Structure 1
Amino acid sequence: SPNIEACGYSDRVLQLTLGNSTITTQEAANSVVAYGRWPEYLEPDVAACRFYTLDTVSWTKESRGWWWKLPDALRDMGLFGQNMYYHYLGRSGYTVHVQCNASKFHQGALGVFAVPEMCLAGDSNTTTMHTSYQNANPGEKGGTFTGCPVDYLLGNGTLLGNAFVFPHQIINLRTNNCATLVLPYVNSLSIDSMVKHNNWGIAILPLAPLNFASESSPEIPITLTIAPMCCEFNGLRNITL
């Protein structure tokens, strides 16, 4: 689906500086808008709309994959976590940026899938949700697939090969080191409870296995930076403390 061929190596470094935060993107070009819709409006504004970096996870030959939930992931991130927790409402878009660096000597391909309403493994259609609020919500450390989400079934009862129906990019080691996904707010309502319902599902699975020459780094790292876009919350409620 993502049959692109930017350049291959590295050309120019253009750093995104949104408020206090500062990413130095590989370039910046090769970004995918989900369904062709930029996030929009239906209060820390520019102060709260800044990319927060989650924890770095280790990609090794045996990795099955990883998954995250939005808003959930960024529930501990300063200004965004707060306005999220001190409001009954909240809707917001996201700029997902997944960086995966290596060399001219590694190989493989990661698929970064952004799935709306990504319910995970519990074939119990006679009842979704299932897994306790704490299990389904792993926050910033994220959850992992296994050969409890089954990788080839994208952990939801649907063969991986078709996951390309959801917006996505493929980080292919020989081409790009970054994937960029602008995801607008997707839900059945104008605005809803951020604490209870998870808007999107960031999925990253080994579409090709990792292979390094002779002896180098035994494993390589991947990073996810997520930025809230057009975030509003109603209504200035409690300020407990």
Structure 2
Amino acid sequence: ACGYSDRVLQLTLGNSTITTQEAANSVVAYGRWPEYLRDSEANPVDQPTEPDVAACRFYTLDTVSWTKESRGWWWKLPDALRDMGLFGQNMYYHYLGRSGYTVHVQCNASKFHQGALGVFAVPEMCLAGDSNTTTMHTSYQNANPGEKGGTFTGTFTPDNNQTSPARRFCPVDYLLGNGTLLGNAFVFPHQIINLRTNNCATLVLPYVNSLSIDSMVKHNNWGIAILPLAPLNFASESSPEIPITLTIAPMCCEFNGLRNITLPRLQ
């Protein structure tokens, strides 16, 4: 009638707005919209801090580049947003924190390009390390890359330097980086950015954890994995490139146990 469509959407949070003309609807992970902590489920006793619009807004992370050889990318939440405005601050000043998210992955091309990206939101996305001599040894620094995120790889290369181990992840793509077959990842809340169809993925994620509230600096609730299901191709070009951009907005975030600021060792 008025022409409303699943393809055209507008998302507004805080002082930010995102529009899209080629969407493929949107996903509300596990059918649960983000929410604040209910009294019946509460844990810490002190009055929580709820930043609202100060933190509940869209933050755009650094843009990456998709080419024929890209294997995939990954990020951790709330890790990726650790340095984002008031959200970052509120995160570091408190011992406890909980937050939901609206993740919007953006990537446009042309009616002449082709390819498909699988955008997956994985609860507790533990990734495999790089050593065949030590397990669970990836260091805090390497486990938390922040906004730049990390990348998947097509081949497992064990770290052989036992003098000074690299202590990093070595996530193999087809293994979703955690020893499970990629073809199954679809069990996790997800969307696919197929160039001929849409130019964006929207995933609304509720706070998911075994506790009501937890330490944000120590533990990442969700993990965002983007892998090319179908490789990039353009015209008859050997080296096409198209950018991929992430914009994430925390939702219904609350924090408890205020103290002095946590100053982590990030390098």
Q: Same fold (TM over 0.5)?
A: yes
Q: Does 1:77 align with 2:76?
A: no
Q: Counterparts in 2 of 1:215-230, with a 5 A limit?
A: 215=237, 218-230=240-252
Moved more, 210-219 or 40-49: 210-219
- Give aligned pairs, total: 235
**In structure 1, what is the Cα distance between the partners aligned to 2:221 and 2:124?**
6
CA displacement at 1:27 relative to structure 2? 5.5
Contact persistence 1:64–1:144 (CA under 8 A): yes
**In structure 1, what is the Cα distance between the partners aligned to 2:244 and 2:51?**
30
Structure 1, residues 144-187: CA drift from partner, whole Å, max 9, x if none? 00001000000100010111111110111011111110111111
Runs of 4+ displaced beyond 6 Å: 6-12, 123-128
Relative to 1, partners in 2 of residues 1:45 and 1:151: Cα closer, same or farther, differing over 3 Å? same
CA displacement at 1:18 relative to structure 2? 2.4
Moved more, 37-46 or 106-115: 37-46
- Structure 2 residues without counterparts, runs of 5 or longer: 38-49, 155-169, 263-267
SS at structure 2 position matched to 1:109: strand
Q: Does 1:150 align with 2:157?
A: no
**In structure 2, what is the Cα distance between the partners aligned to 1:126 and 1:97?**
38
**In structure 2, what is the Cα distance between the partners aligned to 1:81 and 1:157?**
32
Aligned-residue identity in percent? 100
CA displacement at 1:218 relative to structure 2? 2.5
Match of 1:3 in 2: none
Moved more, 117-126 or 190-199: 117-126
Contact persistence 2:92–2:217 (CA under 8 A): yes
Q: Greater CA radius of gyration, 1 or 2?
A: 2
- Structure 1 residues without counterparts, runs of 5 or longer: 1-5
**In structure 2, what is the Cα distance between the partners aligned to 1:24 and 1:12?**
10
CA displacement at 1:22 relative to structure 2? 3.0
Match of 1:92 in 2: 99
Relative to 1, partners in 2 of residues 1:8 and 1:209: Cα closer, same or farther, differing over 3 Å? farther
Contact persistence 1:9–1:175 (CA under 8 A): no
Contact persistence 1:26–1:178 (CA under 8 A): no
CA displacement at 1:239 relative to structure 2? 5.7
Moved more, 217-226 or 66-75: 217-226
Q: Does 1:36 align with 2:31?
A: yes
Q: Does 1:236 align with 2:254?
A: no
Contact persistence 1:86–1:239 (CA under 8 A): yes
**In structure 1, what is the Cα distance between the partners aligned to 2:128 and 2:71?**
15
Contact persistence 1:105–1:213 (CA under 8 A): yes
**In structure 1, what is the Cα distance between the partners aligned to 2:198 and 2:2?**
8
Relative to 1, partners in 2 of residues 1:122 and 1:216: Cα closer, same or farther, differing over 3 Å? closer
Contact persistence 1:119–1:128 (CA under 8 A): no
CA displacement at 1:44 relative to structure 2? 2.2
**In structure 2, what is the Cα distance between the partners aligned to 1:123 and 1:8?**
52
Relative to 1, partners in 2 of residues 1:90 and 1:127: Cα closer, same or farther, differing over 3 Å? farther
Contact persistence 2:22–2:199 (CA under 8 A): no
SS at structure 2 position matched to 1:208: strand
Q: Does 1:66 align with 2:60?
A: no
**In structure 1, what is the Cα distance between the partners aligned to 2:198 and 2:150?**
25
How large is the Cα RMSD of the aligned pairs? Answer: 3.1
**In structure 2, what is the Cα distance between the partners aligned to 1:224 and 1:132?**
25
Structure 1, residues 29-70: CA drift from partner, whole Å, max 9, x if none? 600111111010114212210010000000000000000000
Contact persistence 1:60–1:220 (CA under 8 A): yes
**In structure 2, what is the Cα distance between the partners aligned to 1:226 and 1:203?**
14
Moved more, 24-33 or 136-145: 24-33
Contact persistence 1:119–1:129 (CA under 8 A): no
> TM-score under structure 1 normalisation?
0.89
